[PDB]
Coordinates of C-alpha atoms and ligand atoms in Angstrom, one line a residue:
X1 CA 8.9 12.1 -25.3
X2 CA 7.8 14.9 -22.8
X3 CA 5.4 15.2 -20.3
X4 CA 3.6 17.4 -23.0
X5 CA 2.8 14.8 -25.5
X6 CA 2.0 12.3 -23.3
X7 CA -0.5 14.6 -21.7
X8 CA -2.0 15.5 -25.2
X9 CA -2.6 11.5 -25.4
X10 CA -4.1 11.1 -21.9
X11 CA -6.6 14.1 -22.2
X12 CA -7.1 12.7 -25.7
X13 CA -8.0 9.4 -24.4
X14 CA -9.8 10.8 -21.8
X15 CA -11.9 12.4 -24.3
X16 CA -12.6 9.8 -26.8
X17 CA -13.8 7.3 -23.7
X18 CA -16.4 9.6 -22.5
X19 CA -17.8 11.8 -25.5
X20 CA -20.7 10.2 -25.7
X21 CA -21.8 10.2 -29.5
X22 CA -18.9 8.9 -31.7
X23 CA -18.4 12.0 -34.5
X24 CA -18.4 9.4 -37.5
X25 CA -22.0 8.3 -36.2
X26 CA -23.1 11.9 -36.4
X27 CA -21.4 12.6 -39.5
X28 CA -23.3 9.8 -40.9
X29 CA -26.6 10.2 -39.4
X30 CA -26.7 13.8 -40.7
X31 CA -28.7 12.5 -43.9
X32 CA -31.4 11.2 -41.0
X33 CA -33.5 14.1 -40.5
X34 CA -37.2 13.9 -38.4
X35 CA -40.2 14.3 -41.0
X36 CA -42.7 17.1 -41.2
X37 CA -45.0 14.7 -39.5
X38 CA -42.2 13.6 -36.6
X39 CA -41.7 17.2 -35.7
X40 CA -45.2 18.1 -35.6
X41 CA -45.5 15.1 -33.1
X42 CA -42.9 16.5 -31.1
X43 CA -44.5 20.0 -31.2
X44 CA -47.7 18.3 -29.9
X45 CA -46.1 16.7 -26.9
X46 CA -46.7 18.6 -23.4
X47 CA -43.9 20.8 -22.3
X48 CA -43.5 18.9 -19.5
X49 CA -42.9 15.3 -21.3
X50 CA -40.1 17.5 -23.5
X51 CA -38.9 18.7 -20.0
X52 CA -38.4 15.2 -18.7
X53 CA -36.7 14.1 -22.0
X54 CA -34.5 16.9 -22.4
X55 CA -33.6 17.1 -18.8
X56 CA -32.6 13.1 -18.7
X57 CA -30.7 13.7 -21.6
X58 CA -28.8 16.6 -20.8
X59 CA -28.0 15.0 -16.9
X60 CA -26.5 12.1 -19.0
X61 CA -24.4 14.8 -21.0
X62 CA -23.4 16.2 -17.7
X63 CA -22.4 12.8 -16.2
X64 CA -20.0 12.2 -19.6
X65 CA -18.3 14.9 -18.4
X66 CA -17.6 14.5 -15.1
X67 CA -16.4 11.3 -16.1
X68 CA -14.0 13.2 -18.7
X69 CA -12.8 15.6 -15.4
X70 CA -12.2 12.4 -13.4
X71 CA -9.9 11.0 -15.8
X72 CA -7.7 14.5 -16.2
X73 CA -4.3 14.2 -15.2
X74 CA -4.2 15.7 -11.5
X75 CA -8.1 16.1 -11.4
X76 CA -8.5 13.5 -8.4
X77 CA -5.3 15.0 -6.9
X78 CA -7.5 18.0 -6.6
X79 CA -9.7 18.6 -3.2
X80 CA -12.9 17.8 -3.3
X81 CA -14.0 21.2 -2.4
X82 CA -12.1 22.3 -5.6
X83 CA -13.2 19.7 -8.3
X84 CA -16.8 20.8 -7.4
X85 CA -16.0 24.5 -8.0
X86 CA -14.9 23.4 -11.1
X87 CA -17.5 20.8 -12.5
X88 CA -20.1 23.2 -11.2
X89 CA -19.1 26.2 -13.1
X90 CA -17.6 24.3 -16.1
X91 CA -19.7 20.9 -17.1
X92 CA -22.8 22.9 -18.5
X93 CA -20.3 24.8 -20.5
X94 CA -18.5 22.0 -21.8
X95 CA -21.8 20.4 -22.9
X96 CA -22.7 23.5 -24.7
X97 CA -19.3 23.2 -26.5
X98 CA -19.5 19.2 -27.1
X99 CA -23.1 20.1 -28.8
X100 CA -21.1 21.5 -32.0
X101 CA -20.1 17.9 -32.8
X102 CA -23.9 17.0 -33.3
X103 CA -24.8 19.7 -35.0
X104 CA -25.2 20.4 -38.7
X105 CA -24.7 23.8 -39.8
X106 CA -26.2 23.4 -43.4
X107 CA -29.5 22.9 -42.6
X108 CA -29.1 24.2 -38.8
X109 CA -30.3 20.9 -37.2
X110 CA -29.3 18.8 -34.3
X111 CA -28.9 15.2 -33.8
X112 CA -31.7 14.6 -30.6
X113 CA -33.5 11.3 -30.1
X114 CA -31.9 9.5 -33.1
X115 CA -32.4 11.9 -36.0
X116 CA -31.6 15.7 -37.2
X117 CA -33.7 18.0 -36.3
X118 CA -34.3 22.2 -35.9
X119 CA -34.8 24.0 -32.9
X120 CA -38.6 24.0 -33.8
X121 CA -38.5 20.5 -32.6
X122 CA -38.6 22.0 -29.1
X123 CA -41.6 24.7 -29.6
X124 CA -43.6 22.9 -26.6
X125 CA -40.8 24.3 -24.1
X126 CA -41.3 27.4 -24.8
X127 CA -37.9 29.0 -24.5
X128 CA -37.5 29.7 -28.2
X129 CA -35.2 32.6 -27.9
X130 CA -32.6 30.8 -25.3
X131 CA -32.9 27.7 -27.7
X132 CA -32.0 30.0 -30.5
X133 CA -29.1 31.6 -29.2
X134 CA -27.9 28.0 -28.0
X135 CA -28.4 26.6 -31.8
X136 CA -26.6 30.3 -32.7
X137 CA -23.7 29.4 -30.4
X138 CA -23.3 26.1 -32.1
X139 CA -23.5 27.4 -35.5
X140 CA -20.6 30.0 -34.6
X141 CA -18.4 26.9 -33.2
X142 CA -19.4 24.6 -36.4
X143 CA -17.3 26.9 -38.7
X144 CA -14.1 25.9 -36.7
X145 CA -14.5 22.6 -38.1
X146 CA -12.8 21.6 -34.5
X147 CA -11.1 18.4 -34.9
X148 CA -11.8 15.8 -32.0
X149 CA -8.7 16.5 -30.6
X150 CA -9.0 20.2 -30.5
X151 CA -12.6 19.7 -28.4
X152 CA -10.8 17.5 -26.0
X153 CA -8.1 20.0 -25.2
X154 CA -10.1 22.9 -25.5
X155 CA -12.8 21.5 -23.3
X156 CA -10.4 20.4 -20.8
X157 CA -9.6 24.1 -20.4
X158 CA -13.1 25.0 -19.9
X159 CA -13.1 22.7 -16.9
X160 CA -9.5 23.4 -15.7
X161 CA -9.8 27.4 -14.9
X162 CA -7.9 28.8 -11.7
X163 CA -10.1 31.6 -12.3
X164 CA -13.2 30.1 -10.8
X165 CA -14.5 31.8 -7.6
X166 CA -14.2 29.8 -4.6
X167 CA -11.1 27.8 -5.2
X168 CA -9.2 26.8 -1.8
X169 CA -6.2 25.8 -3.5
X170 CA -5.3 28.1 -6.5
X171 CA -1.8 27.5 -7.3
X172 CA -2.8 23.6 -8.2
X173 CA -5.4 24.4 -10.4
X174 CA -2.6 27.1 -11.9
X175 CA -0.5 24.2 -12.5
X176 CA -2.8 21.7 -14.1
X177 CA -3.9 24.7 -16.4
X178 CA -0.5 26.1 -17.7
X179 CA -0.1 22.4 -18.4
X180 CA -3.0 21.8 -20.6
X181 CA -2.2 25.3 -22.1
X182 CA 0.9 24.1 -23.6
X183 CA -0.6 20.9 -24.4
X184 CA -3.3 22.9 -26.5
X185 CA -0.9 25.5 -27.8
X186 CA 2.1 22.6 -28.8
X187 CA -1.0 20.7 -30.6
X188 CA -2.1 23.4 -33.0
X189 CA 1.6 24.6 -33.6
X190 CA 2.3 20.7 -34.4
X191 CA -1.3 20.6 -36.8
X192 CA -1.0 24.5 -38.1
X193 CA -4.0 25.1 -36.5
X194 CA -3.1 28.2 -34.3
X195 CA -5.5 30.1 -36.7
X196 CA -8.2 28.9 -34.8
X197 CA -7.3 30.7 -31.4
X198 CA -8.7 34.1 -32.8
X199 CA -12.1 32.3 -33.8
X200 CA -12.6 30.8 -29.8
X201 CA -15.7 32.3 -28.1
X202 CA -15.2 35.4 -26.1
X203 CA -15.0 33.8 -22.5
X204 CA -17.7 35.5 -21.3
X205 CA -19.9 34.5 -24.1
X206 CA -20.1 30.8 -23.1
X207 CA -20.5 31.9 -19.3
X208 CA -23.7 33.9 -20.0
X209 CA -25.1 31.5 -22.4
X210 CA -24.4 28.6 -19.7
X211 CA -25.4 30.6 -16.8
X212 CA -29.2 31.7 -18.8
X213 CA -29.5 27.6 -19.7
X214 CA -29.1 26.9 -16.4
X215 CA -31.2 29.3 -14.9
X216 CA -33.9 28.0 -17.1
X217 CA -33.3 24.1 -16.5
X218 CA -33.6 25.3 -12.6
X219 CA -37.0 26.4 -13.5
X220 CA -38.0 23.7 -15.0
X221 CA -36.8 21.9 -12.4
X222 CA -38.7 24.1 -9.4
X223 CA -42.0 23.6 -11.5
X224 CA -41.9 20.3 -12.0
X225 CA -39.0 18.1 -10.3
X226 CA -37.0 15.5 -12.3
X227 CA -35.8 11.8 -11.2
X228 CA -31.6 12.1 -11.6
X229 CA -29.9 8.8 -12.3
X230 CA -27.6 10.8 -9.6
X231 CA -23.8 9.2 -9.6
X232 CA -22.3 12.2 -7.9
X233 CA -23.6 13.3 -4.3
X234 CA -21.2 16.1 -3.7
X235 CA -22.3 17.8 -7.5
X236 CA -25.7 16.8 -7.2
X237 CA -26.1 18.4 -4.0
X238 CA -24.6 21.7 -5.3
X239 CA -27.3 21.9 -8.2
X240 CA -30.5 20.2 -6.6
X241 CA -32.6 21.2 -3.9
Ligands
L3E1 O1 -25.1 12.3 -11.3 C1 -25.2 13.4 -10.9 O2 -24.9 13.3 -9.3 C2 -25.6 14.9 -11.4 C3 -25.5 15.9 -10.2 C4 -25.5 16.9 -11.3 C5 -26.1 16.9 -12.5 N1 -26.4 18.0 -13.4 C6 -26.8 19.1 -13.2 C7 -27.1 20.5 -14.0 C8 -28.1 21.0 -14.5 C9 -29.7 20.1 -14.8 C10 -29.7 19.6 -15.8 CL1 -28.3 18.6 -16.4 C11 -31.0 18.6 -15.8 C12 -32.0 19.0 -15.3 C13 -32.1 20.1 -14.1 C14 -31.1 20.6 -13.7 C15 -30.7 21.8 -12.8 F1 -30.2 23.2 -13.6 F2 -31.6 21.7 -11.8 F3 -29.6 22.1 -12.1 N2 -28.2 22.0 -14.8 O3 -26.2 22.4 -14.8 C16 -25.9 21.4 -14.2 C17 -24.7 21.3 -13.8 C18 -23.6 20.7 -13.2 C19 -22.7 21.0 -13.3 N3 -22.6 22.2 -13.6 C20 -23.7 22.5 -14.1 C21 -26.0 15.8 -13.3 C22 -25.8 14.7 -12.8
HCD2 C1 -33.4 25.0 -22.0 C2 -34.0 23.2 -22.2 C3 -34.9 22.8 -21.1 C4 -34.1 22.8 -23.8 C5 -32.8 22.6 -24.2 C6 -33.0 22.2 -25.6 C7 -32.0 21.9 -26.3 C8 -30.8 23.1 -26.8 O1 -32.4 21.8 -27.8 C9 -30.8 20.8 -26.1 C10 -32.4 19.5 -25.6 C11 -31.3 18.2 -25.5 C12 -30.1 18.8 -25.7 C13 -28.6 17.7 -26.2 C14 -28.8 16.7 -25.4 C15 -27.5 15.9 -25.3 C16 -26.3 16.1 -26.4 C17 -25.3 15.1 -25.9 C18 -24.0 15.8 -26.0 O2 -22.5 14.7 -26.3 C19 -23.9 17.0 -26.5 C20 -24.8 18.1 -26.4 C21 -26.6 17.0 -26.5 C22 -26.2 17.2 -28.5 C23 -27.2 18.5 -26.1 C24 -27.4 19.4 -26.9 C25 -29.0 20.7 -26.7 C26 -29.8 19.9 -26.4 C27 -30.1 19.6 -27.6

C-alpha cells in the first residue's frame, strides 16, 4: 500500500539477508553448552590468541552490519562522508544490539564458536569488567524478547541518526530517519508491541558502552595488530592506523 509498509518490508529483508546467524539456529543450539573442560581450554589460551579470534569475529560482525546499511533505502544515495560518519558511530552499536539474539538469559551465555558459553570463557583477555558490562547489556535487552522485525527496525534507527556530529547533508539523513521512525512506530502499533518503547536502552547507555568497547579493541590492536579481511576501504581508514 504505502511507502511505509514497503519500507518495513525492505528493512526486514535487508536484515534477513545480513543477520549473520539465524534465530531458529541460535534458539535450537541453546542446549549445546561448552563443557567444563572446553571452558578451561579457552581460559588457558593466550590473551593474544583469544584477541585474534575475537577480533576476527567482531570484524566479520561489523561487515554484516555494513551490508545491512548498504541495503537500507536511501543509504547509498547519501554522500560518502555521511555514510562513513553513520557507520563509524553506529556499526558497533548495532553489533552490540545484535548480540542479544545470541544470548541466553536463563544461564547468561552467548553463542561463540559453535556452542554457548559464559563470560568466564573470555578470562584470558583480562577485561572482565568490560565483558561483564556487555553481557549485562544483552541481559537487559533479552527481557524485551525482541522480534526479528523489531531488531531490524531498531538497528536501522541506531544507524540512521541525523544527530551524529560531522554530517554534511543533515536534512537528507533526517528524511531517512523520519521514515524509519514512522515504519518502526507503525509496526509496533500494528503488532501491539508499543510497550517496548519505554523499555529500550537510554541512547547514552549504548553510546558509552560502545565507546568503552571500541576503546579496548583499539588498545588490543595497538599492542597486537591483526590482519583484517578488509572490504570497505573508507571505513577501514577511519578505524585502523
Ligand atoms: O571490511 C572493512 O573494511 C572493515 C572496516 C572496519 C571494521 N571494523 C572496525 C571496528 C573495530 C575493530 C574491530 Cl571489529 C576489530 C578489531 C579492532 C577494531 C578497532 F577498534 F581497532 F577498529 N572496532 O569498531 C569498529 C567500527 C567500525 C565501525 N564502527 C566501529 C571492520 C571491517
Ligand atoms: C573487548 C573484546 C577484546 C572482547 C569482547 C568479548 C565478547 C563480548 O565476549 C565478544 C567476543 C566475540 C563477540 C561476538 C562475535 C560475533 C557475534 C555475531 C553477531 O551477529 C552478534 C554479536 C556476536 C555474538 C559478538 C558478541 C560479543 C562477543 C561475544
